[PDB]
Design a protein around this nucleic acid. Structure first.
Ligand SMILES: [Mg+2]
Ligand SMILES: [Mg+2]
Ligand SMILES: [Mg+2]
Ligand SMILES: [Mg+2]
Ligand SMILES: [Mg+2]
Ligand SMILES: [Mg+2]
Ligand SMILES: [Mg+2]
Ligand SMILES: [Mg+2]
Ligand SMILES: [Mg+2]
Ligand SMILES: [Mg+2]
Ligand SMILES: [Mg+2]
Ligand SMILES: [Mg+2]
Ligand SMILES: [Mg+2]
Ligand SMILES: [Mg+2]
Ligand SMILES: [Mg+2]
Ligand SMILES: [Mg+2]
Ligand SMILES: [Mg+2]
Ligand SMILES: [Mg+2]
Ligand SMILES: [Mg+2]
Ligand SMILES: [Mg+2]
Ligand SMILES: [Mg+2]
Ligand SMILES: [Mg+2]
Ligand SMILES: [Mg+2]
Ligand SMILES: [Mg+2]
Ligand SMILES: [Mg+2]
Ligand SMILES: [Mg+2]
Ligand SMILES: [Mg+2]
Ligand SMILES: [Mg+2]
Ligand SMILES: [Mg+2]
Ligand SMILES: [Mg+2]
Ligand SMILES: [Mg+2]
Ligand SMILES: [Mg+2]
Ligand SMILES: [Mg+2]
Ligand SMILES: [Mg+2]
Ligand SMILES: [Mg+2]
Ligand SMILES: [Mg+2]
Ligand SMILES: [Mg+2]
Ligand SMILES: [Mg+2]
Ligand SMILES: [Mg+2]
Lengths: 51, 120, 202
RNA sequence: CACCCCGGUGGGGGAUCCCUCGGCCUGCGCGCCGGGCAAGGACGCGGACGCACGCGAUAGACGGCACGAUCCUCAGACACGACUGCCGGUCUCCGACAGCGGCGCAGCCGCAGACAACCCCCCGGACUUAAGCAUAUCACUAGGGGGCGGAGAAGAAACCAACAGGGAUUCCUGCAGUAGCGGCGAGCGAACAGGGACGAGCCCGCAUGGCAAUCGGCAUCGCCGAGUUGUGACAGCGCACCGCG
RNA sequence: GCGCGAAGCGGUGGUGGCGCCAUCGAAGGCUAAAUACGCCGCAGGACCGAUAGCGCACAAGUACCGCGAGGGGACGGCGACGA
RNA sequence: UAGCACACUCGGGCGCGAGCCCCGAGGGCCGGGAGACGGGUUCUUCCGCCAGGCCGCUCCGCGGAAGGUGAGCCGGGUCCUAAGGACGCGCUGGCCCGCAACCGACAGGCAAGCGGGCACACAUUCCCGCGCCGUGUGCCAUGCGGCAACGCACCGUGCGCGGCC
RNA sequence: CGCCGCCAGGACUCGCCCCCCGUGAAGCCCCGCGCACGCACACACACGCCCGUACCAAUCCGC
RNA sequence: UCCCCAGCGAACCCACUGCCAAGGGAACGGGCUUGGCGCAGUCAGCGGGGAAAGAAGACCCUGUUGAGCUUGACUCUAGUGUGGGGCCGCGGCCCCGCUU
């Protein structure tokens, strides 16, 4: 909330860079059974537990 | 494998220290070209790996050099002792386990092991 | 509280010095509180007989006899054994030392003179040594210093000292020193074995 | 016309059957953590990389050895060794200190933390059974605390016996659901044998006195230290271990 | 645990006392093997065959929930991978 | 079926598509703008949508691709203590307890930054102007005025006594 | 005031006064004096660490 | 608001259900018996009935099922208090000094 410790922001950045779709070149790989990232996180539905 | 290990064995340890610094510089110039322009996909890969290759040969030469420095030392450095296990490093030696008192020595000496065969 | 910090200063109680850095301060305080309690109790004759030790002039006369029979050092022994005859000469006369050895020579009645240290703690290591030396008739003396007895035999300290025979060049010195210490220790046994010290003295 | 029933086709849903790189069970093997920084965590690391998995600033194969031609989504890499395998390096940071302890000790070390199936020590229930219930039972269990090891613990009789005597411990069989304990209620409950597996025995202390003969440390054959309040003893290990069928 | 507190002879004898006779030597120490056992590795099996079998054959202790201690799923299948 | 927007209206625009998106006009209504905790990229730009939004959407806190958070002066730490905690040691069979290093405040105590520009958004942080604070190095003087209230020599360190609600 | 006037309201604030069987922090920094020490403010030069920093009257918590 | 519409779009509940009268029946039937009727199965109202739905009756009883609580219940128990012993000191007459 605009004031955070160093640990809170690093955990918040790690949650942010994680939250992205599957790169589209991975859909052409053989044995890629994943179509969308099921671990996508939306900020309003899913909460992070970064206190 | 752009820098081969065959050439790195000829260099000395401080000569490999300067090479890893020079190769780290070229990796920074490669990471510049990756951000600004295109690159062949494994150029950063290759330069990262031959930094590791120079540093490994540096470590392998340094383990060999430091071993012959402290070979006949009372206490060798902990790097150069074999890392068995904390329990196995603290084990008694086989000489120490075979240590017995004087009565057990005299008895085994005066009554040694006999080699015999029985038949009825 | 400031009154309590003054309270634990007025009493000198070693159990108040409970921290780690106060450890050397504490055991100095224990040593003096023991010493005041040790001498305020009625010391029995078995312990208090070691308070009567030998005079400084008499101690120097006693040990000057013993210095003729000082055992060899380890450096002297080492070159003695590499010599051509290590057992050359007659059997030497040495100070016999150590509690196991000395009480064996006392019970076998072959010690001529026994020196017992005075400062030995636990004192029960040597409390039998006067009364055993009387039951064998061996003349004994109590000398202050386990440390001074240790230097005669090249140790830091040793509790009891004896020698089993005297050279003929020291025989009349030996009978003068036996008569000097028997008037103190051996002949005053039945007086010293009733004498209570400490708080009984007051 | 709606409604209902039967059939056909189409839906709907995922039963059935077939499959199975998964589980479960049993046996065997292994039984190897940690200041040389463990377990666990945090954060980072792929050219395009989210997750998973791998890894640690040497960060998505670094070295040696073996292998020998592919890896692949793109781009590319590749006999100056692809893809692999085995082993070794590197191995961030948090997480084991108000630390504690040993040794004369220029200093060198150890303990802590993990593991919780097995084993050892301490602490220790209640539901339950008694057709209630309080002793009893559950149970000297569960659980908690502490501590090891590859096993542990036990162990060479202050034993069993009553014979014509056996002979460490542990385990099996067996004594035996017995003797016995028990509101003699519910219930609980061993031991010696006999048979067997396996087998193994030893030691400190009161060691010389014509000399501690013993040990620790070192910058080492000499010091310093321990020690007479008493130190003192060597029989077991190791290597090798295929490539075709 | 506490009180008392030994001995040169002592302990014990299914366990009241005492006596006999018999049998051992406590209050110091070590000791393989046979014995027990999870993870893991290996091999098996009259086991189960995707609501079964482990909670998980799948990006499973994951997603997700709980302040917290903790709780905890669901989801397998084209073909000659040549079209 | 229950239920779900029912103070808006008119014209225009982009667009396959418009009651709701944009623009203009008219008519109304009420908060809006800054911090904390909490959220964590929702911010902003570009592109999208036949999915989500209690209708629709060309819109969006949605989907995709990007961009963005710059400090001696703001806040915290490198400072201080409060109530209080305390992993060490004593006391223990274990606690309690005693001493207590250390810790404990993003609203306490508490050095010093404002005006403006720029900008898609962000800046008291960048830029411009004018300041200020602290630290570290160098380079030393050895005092005076006023009856008095006091005025001044832009000087330091230690101790003691005091100094805030 | 010197290098737009007049009137009113106002957060806040000094001191009086009132209130209390309530009396309204601590410590560091700092300052002052006292007593000692020995010297560096100005000036000039140099320098200034880590973390946070977007946004949130539909962005929070009540699924 | 309802009502009607575009779009969106649930839940409760559900053995099966044409409606009455009397009778019989577990003694108050939607179904049985004997009679009386109604049936295009639609819209909106409505609260008579379905002994309407909620919820393994909270009342009452039973249980050798509890818990909260009380005390002159039973058996115990922390706490308080008491006696004796252990807690190694000197002196003097249980008493008095003393300190270590
Ligand atoms: Mg926050
Ligand atoms: Mg929310
Ligand atoms: Mg049909
Ligand atoms: Mg299924
Ligand atoms: Mg198994
Ligand atoms: Mg590590
Ligand atoms: Mg490699
Ligand atoms: Mg441990
Ligand atoms: Mg049960
Ligand atoms: Mg019962
Ligand atoms: Mg029952
Ligand atoms: Mg009952
Ligand atoms: Mg182990
Ligand atoms: Mg053992
Ligand atoms: Mg039992
Ligand atoms: Mg010995
Ligand atoms: Mg073949
Ligand atoms: Mg006997
Ligand atoms: Mg009998
Ligand atoms: Mg024994
Ligand atoms: Mg199936
Ligand atoms: Mg399953
Ligand atoms: Mg809740
Ligand atoms: Mg409707
Ligand atoms: Mg409205
Ligand atoms: Mg705001
Ligand atoms: Mg926006
Ligand atoms: Mg749409
Ligand atoms: Mg710590
Ligand atoms: Mg503050
Ligand atoms: Mg500035
Ligand atoms: Mg803004
Ligand atoms: Mg409608
Ligand atoms: Mg009727
Ligand atoms: Mg009818
Ligand atoms: Mg109707
Ligand atoms: Mg009704
Ligand atoms: Mg009922
Ligand atoms: Mg009954």
């Amino acid at each position: 909330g605009s004031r955070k410790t160093e640990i809170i922001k690093t955990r918040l950045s790690r949650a942010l860079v994680r939250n992205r779709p599957i790169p589209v070149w991975k859909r052409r790989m053989r044995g890629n059974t994943q179509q969308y990232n099921m671990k996508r996180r939306h900020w309003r539905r899913n909460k992070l537990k970064i206190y | 494998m752009k820098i081969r290990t065959l050439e790195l064995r000829e260099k000395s340890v401080e000569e490999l220290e300067t090479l890893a610094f020079s190769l780290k510089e070229e990796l920074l110039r490669l990471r510049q070209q990756k951000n600004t322009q295109t690159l062949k996909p494994h150029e950063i890969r290759v330069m990262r790996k031959n930094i590791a290759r120079v540093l490994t040969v540096r470590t392998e030469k340094l383990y060999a050099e430091m071993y012959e420095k402290h070979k006949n030392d009372k206490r060798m450095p902990k790097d150069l002792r074999p890392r068995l296990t904390k329990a196995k490093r603290m084990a008694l030696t086989k000489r120490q386990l075979n240590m017995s008192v004087h009565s057990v020595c005299k008895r085994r000496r005066a009554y040694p092991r006999m080699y015999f065969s029985y038949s009825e | 509280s400031q009154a309590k910090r003054e309270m634990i200063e007025r009493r000198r109680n070693p159990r108040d010095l409970d921290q780690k850095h106060q450890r050397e301060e504490r055991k100095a305080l224990i040593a003096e509180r023991v010493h005041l309690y040790r001498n305020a109790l009625r010391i029995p004759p078995a312990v208090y007989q070691f308070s009567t030790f030998l005079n400084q002039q008499d101690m120097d006369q006693v040990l000057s006899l013993f210095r003729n029979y000082i055992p060899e050092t380890r450096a002297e022994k080492k070159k003695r054994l590499m010599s051509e005859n290590p057992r050359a000469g007659r059997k030497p006369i040495l100070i016999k030392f150590g509690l196991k050895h000395v009480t064996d020579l006392i019970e076998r009645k072959e010690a001529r003179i026994v020196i017992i240290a005075s400062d030995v703690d636990p004192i029960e290591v040597v409390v039998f040594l006067p009364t055993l030396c009387r039951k064998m008739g061996i003349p004994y003396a109590i000398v202050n210093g386990k440390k001074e007895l240790g230097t005669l035999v090249h140790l830091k300290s040793t509790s009891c000292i004896c020698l089993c025979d005297v050279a003929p060049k020291d025989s009349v010195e030996f009978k003068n020193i036996l008569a000097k210490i028997n008037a103190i220790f051996m002949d005053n046994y039945e007086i010293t074995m009733k004498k209570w010290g400490g708080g009984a003295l007051l």
